[PDB]
Curated annotation (Swiss-Prot), chain B:
Self-association state and partner proteins as the record states: The RNAP catalytic core consists of 2 alpha, 1 beta, 1 beta' and 1 omega subunit. When a sigma factor is associated with the core the holoenzyme is formed, which can initiate transcription.
Function, in words: DNA-dependent RNA polymerase catalyzes the transcription of DNA into RNA using the four ribonucleoside triphosphates as substrates.
Binding positions (Zn(2+) 1): C54, C56, C69, C72
TM helices/strands, residue ranges: none
Superkingdom field: Bacteria
Protein name: DNA-directed RNA polymerase subunit beta'
Residue window of the full protein shown: 7 to 146 of 1299
Similarity field: Belongs to the RNA polymerase beta' chain family.
Curated annotation (Swiss-Prot), chain C:
Gene name of the record: rpoB
Organism: Streptomyces coelicolor (strain ATCC BAA-471 / A3(2) / M145)
Superkingdom, taxonomy of origin: Bacteria
Main function: DNA-dependent RNA polymerase catalyzes the transcription of DNA into RNA using the four ribonucleoside triphosphates as substrates.
Record-stated family: Belongs to the RNA polymerase beta chain family.
Subunit structure: The RNAP catalytic core consists of 2 alpha, 1 beta, 1 beta' and 1 omega subunit. When a sigma factor is associated with the core the holoenzyme is formed, which can initiate transcription. The RNAP complex including the principal sigma factor HrdB also interacts with RNA-binding protein RbpA.
Stated name of the protein: DNA-directed RNA polymerase subunit beta
Lineage, broadest ranks: Bacteria, Bacillati, Actinomycetota, Actinomycetes, Kitasatosporales
Residues of the full protein shown: 1017 to 1131 of 1161
Curated annotation (Swiss-Prot), chain D:
Residue segments, region Sigma-70 factor domain-2: 69-139
Transcription found in the keyword field: yes
Region Sigma-70 factor domain-3, annotated ranges: 148-224
This protein's UniProt keywords: DNA-binding, Sigma factor, Transcription, Transcription regulation
Covered range of the whole protein: 210 to 510 of 511
Binds RNA polymerase-binding protein RbpA: region residues: 2-138
Protein name, entry field: RNA polymerase principal sigma factor HrdB
Gene this chain is encoded by: hrdB
């Protein structure tokens, strides 16, 4: 398609294509056309158009643009919240976020180096895919296929995993906290009290 | 404390939050046990490991706080600032947030009328897209 | 004679070690650990309507770094207990959710809020 | 696009024509032809446009030959990366690093050597893989010289265990590398790996290893209140002394500011000499050492 | 132990020229007495040897040599 | 029931399988006439599996010596 004719259709692959699409996406006409479809429509197509209208209108009313879907800069947790604390015995204690951030940084550096020198499309595409997988594992490790097992004994903790579940922050360090000025001991019966 | 407004974090916002840029995967040198430069744990971006103590030896006192030594760039202040300050990583090629995609259609939303298989095959580099066509030019 | 002796079970704590990633007291007896105030405990306290006891049991007695030194100082000096601040775990939560590309902004009714 | 991205990478390698001798020597011939073409194009001297376009075309053909060779040996690197997997680096990451090494080898390979490409490549593939393993495998980065020292120590220690059938003593170990026992201990200690906080504590669900270790930065309330009481008592005791005496001793010991001022530095704002200040400071020390203003401060140490 | 050793057939390369035979396994008395291991923090183990035989059709020779695989708890 | 013998045997078996894989790799990457049973076999997997069993495993449980009956049970 490229060779036989060019300067007419623009194509791409990966998240860059999605960013280009959302940049030029015109949600107002989509909302209008979906309203028209809802006015005269039947079947499950009506429900699909309903969901599409819900999200498109939610984005239209809000001032934030849809391009926030495709992030460009990954934030990094403050170091004290992912402590590499010294441990007695010459050993070390690290959080899995350290490993995940290291992975994304390594892959970003290699991606940059591959782009500096003239490199093939296959290797650079696979490298970009590795970066995508690294970022996805950083935010949510275990949401696609096998998780990033790290040491191999257990899946690594992820940014979302710290914000979810029985052991997550919400239900373990905000609604139920430990407290000073307290005690515990077995109970006996005192009838003279 | 009146309202916790939440929303999509654009690239400009993440840049604004960041006090620097993370360029290396280094954490701590194996001998001096101190955070490295421009990597993870770097004091030039996150904060001083010790109270009012910079990295290069120049300032070790509480008297002259709130200053930036030109040697290593660490801004002398309380060590608690490391818990608050955060950095960012500039990706050479953009990626997609795993949360909004790969899920129920209330978060993905069908914002682009493509099936989840298409997205899975496109964002992970297994198929192409036609981002734009000069259809009027082609017809002309 | 069972091994559930009272000597092993007896534990108490005015103030002791604290955890690192989150500044709440750590658990256990060997490390002077405060007892946990679970979710059902806060539910039961809400059922009484006791809001102030809850406010101290969540802020002054844990999870607030600026408040603990101040309350110990006030108790020792006899001064009345000071106003609790914001907790640390909430700050950890907002910093974490800021790290998922969610600009969680704390705002006031009249523009930006003071914290 | 599926799970386990290495499988999709393997399919992406797909079916490509493996190169026999004459095929690859012809490819290298047109590679150097394109190299000379782009070299001629790079010169500032004027070349008429048609020959320049022909030079660019042969250079593009050389680039296509380059890509053919790269895809041909992608298979080679995957085997080589597998040769090194399981050492803290993900297999696909090792594969990509091997791809980088192969790119280097191709850029530095030519038919002037009377040998196949597969023999010359593996050296550089192993070079890149081992460099990346040293520089990116461990959480605490270890310099490459230190990585080779530790791995040499490890392997010779395994060899000693194999021969003697017992754990080698540190002294026999030290003489083997010819370094001192001190270096042996340092290298043994420098070769560890961090243990993750987010690991089971041993019980079913009793949190994880990150909530059983106390921090050191936490201000102990007992110490803080004791220090505040010390500050108050010290300030009151100084107020007991005369105004000038209290001021000069406080400046000499920075009770108002974190930097104490030495004697002559006290003798500028107060208008007294470097020695007058010395004598009155000594008298203040003598007065404070009196049993009167010492009973309260003794308990504070 | 002998069953698991015999289950492992001699390794054959792609040429099938070479082979390793693990015929017999044997023990030696433990070096550390039970109270000694308990006191000084040692695992109560004993050595376990096995005779490995090297045979190659190309060489047409058999080489026998005992090997030691570590301490057995 | 997988008595203690069978559990330890399974761990020895996986260790010996890893050993077999390693020695097969070595044959694929070694020259003839320089191959002897002593040098080829790598004992790290067997020892590191039988040591990773007795520590960090559910079945190898800490003895409770509260009394002889507790030990028996
Ligand atoms: Zn400095």
């Amino acid at each position: 398609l490229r060779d036989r004719f060019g300067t007419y259709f623009d194509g791409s692959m990966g998240a860059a294509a999605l960013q280009k699409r959302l940049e030029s996406f015109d949600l107002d006409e989509e909302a209008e056309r979906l309203r028209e479809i809802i006015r005269t429509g039947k079947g499950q197509k009506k429900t699909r158009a309903l969901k599409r209208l819900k999200v498109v209108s939610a984005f239209l009313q809000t001032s934030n643009s849809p391009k926030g879907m495709v992030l460009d800069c990954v934030p990094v947790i403050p170091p004290d919240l992912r402590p590499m604390v010294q441990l007695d015995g010459g050993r070390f204690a690290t959080s899995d976020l350290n490993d995940l951030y290291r992975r994304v940084i390594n892959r970003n550096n290699r991606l940059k180096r591959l782009l500096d020198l003239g490199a093939p499309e296959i290797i650079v595409n696979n490298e970009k895919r590795m970066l995508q997988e690294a970022v996805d594992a950083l935010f949510d490790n275990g949401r696609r296929g096998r998780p990033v097992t790290g040491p191999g004994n257990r899946p690594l903790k992820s940014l979302s995993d710290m914000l979810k579940g029985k052991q997550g922050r919400f239900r373990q360090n905000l609604l139920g906290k430990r407290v000073d000025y307290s005690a515990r001991s077995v109970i006996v019966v005192g009838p003279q009290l | 404390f009146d309202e916790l407004r939440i929303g999509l974090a654009t690239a400009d916002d993440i840049r604004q939050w960041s006090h620097g840029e993370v360029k290396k995967p280094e954490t701590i040198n194996y001998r001096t046990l101190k955070p490295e430069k421009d990597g993870l744990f770097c004091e030039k971006i996150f904060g001083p490991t010790r109270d009012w103590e910079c990295y290069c030896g120049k300032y070790k006192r509480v008297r002259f706080k709130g200053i930036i030594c030109e040697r290593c760039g660490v801004e002398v202040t309380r060590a608690k600032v490391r818990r608050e300050r955060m950095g960012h990583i500039e990706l050479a090629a953009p990626v997609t947030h795993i949360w909004y995609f790969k899920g129920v259609p209330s978060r993905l939303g069908y914002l682009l009328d493509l099936a989840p298989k298409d997205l899975e095959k496109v964002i992970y580099f297994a198929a192409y897209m036609i981002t734009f066509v000069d259809e009027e030019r082609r017809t002309r | 004679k069972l091994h559930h002796l009272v000597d092993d079970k007896l534990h108490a704590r005015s103030t002791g070690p604290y955890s690192m990633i989150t500044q709440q007291p750590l658990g256990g007896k060997a490390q002077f650990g405060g007892q946990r105030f679970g979710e059902m405990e806060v539910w039961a306290l809400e059922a009484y309507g006791a809001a102030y006891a809850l406010q101290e049991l969540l802020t002054i007695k844990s999870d607030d770094v600026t408040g603990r030194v101040k309350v110990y100082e006030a108790i020792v000096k006899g001064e009345n207990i000071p106003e609790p601040g914001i907790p640390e775990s909430f700050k950890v939560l907002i910093k974490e959710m800021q790290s998922l590309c969610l600009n969680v902004e704390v705002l006031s009714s009249d523009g930006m809020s003071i914290e | 696009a599926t799970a386990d991205p290495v499988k999709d990478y393997l399919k992406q390698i797909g079916k490509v024509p493996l190169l026999n001798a004459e095929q690859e020597v012809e490819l290298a011939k047109r590679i150097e032809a394109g190299l000379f073409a782009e070299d001629k194009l790079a010169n500032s001297d004027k070349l008429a446009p048609k020959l320049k376009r022909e030079l660019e075309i042969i250079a593009e053909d050389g680039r296509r030959a380059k890509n053919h060779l790269l895809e041909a040996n992608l298979r080679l690197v995957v085997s080589l990366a597998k040769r090194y997997t399981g050492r803290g680096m993900l297999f696909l990451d090792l594969i990509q690093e091997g791809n980088l090494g192969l790119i280097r080898a191709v850029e530095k390979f030519d038919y002037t050597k009377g040998y196949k490409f597969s023999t010359y490549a593996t050296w550089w593939i192993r070079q890149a893989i081992t460099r990346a393993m040293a520089d990116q495998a461990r959480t605490i980065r270890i310099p490459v010289h230190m990585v080779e020292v530790i791995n040499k120590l490890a392997r010779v220690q395994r060899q000693m265990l194999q021969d003697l059938g017992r754990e080698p003593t540190p002294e026999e170990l030290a003489k083997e590398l010819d370094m001192t026992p001190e270096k042996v201990i340092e290298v043994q200690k420098y070769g560890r790996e961090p243990i993750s906080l987010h690991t089971p504590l041993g019980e079913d669900g009793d949190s994880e290893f990150g909530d059983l270790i106390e921090d050191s930065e936490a201000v102990v309330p007992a110490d803080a209140v004791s220090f505040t009481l010390l500050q108050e008592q010290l300030h009151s005791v100084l107020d007991t002394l005369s105004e000038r005496e209290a001021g000069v001793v406080s400046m000499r010991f920075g009770l108002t500011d974190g930097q104490p001022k030495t004697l002559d530095e006290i003798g500028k704002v107060y208008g007294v000499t470097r020695e007058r200040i010395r004598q009155i400071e000594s008298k203040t020390m003598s007065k404070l050492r009196h049993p009167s203003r010492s009973q309260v401060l003794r308990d504070y140490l | 132990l002998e069953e698991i050793f015999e289950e492992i057939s001699p390794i054959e390369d792609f040429s099938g020229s070479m082979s390793l035979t693990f015929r017999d396994h044997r023990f030696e008395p433990p070096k550390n007495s039970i109270d000694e291991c308990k006191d000084r923090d040692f695992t109560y183990a004993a050595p376990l040897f096995v005779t490995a035989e090297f045979t190659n059709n190309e060489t047409g020779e058999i080489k026998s040599q005992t090997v030691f695989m570590g301490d057995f708890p | 029931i997988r008595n203690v013998g069978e559990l330890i045997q399974n761990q020895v078996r996986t260790g010996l399988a890893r050993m077999e894989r390693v020695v097969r790799e070595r044959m694929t990457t070694q020259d003839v006439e320089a191959i002897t049973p002593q040098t080829l076999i790598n004992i790290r997997p067997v020892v590191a599996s039988i040591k990773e069993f007795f520590g960090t495993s559910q079945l190898s449980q800490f003895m409770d010596q509260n009394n002889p009956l507790s030990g028996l049970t």
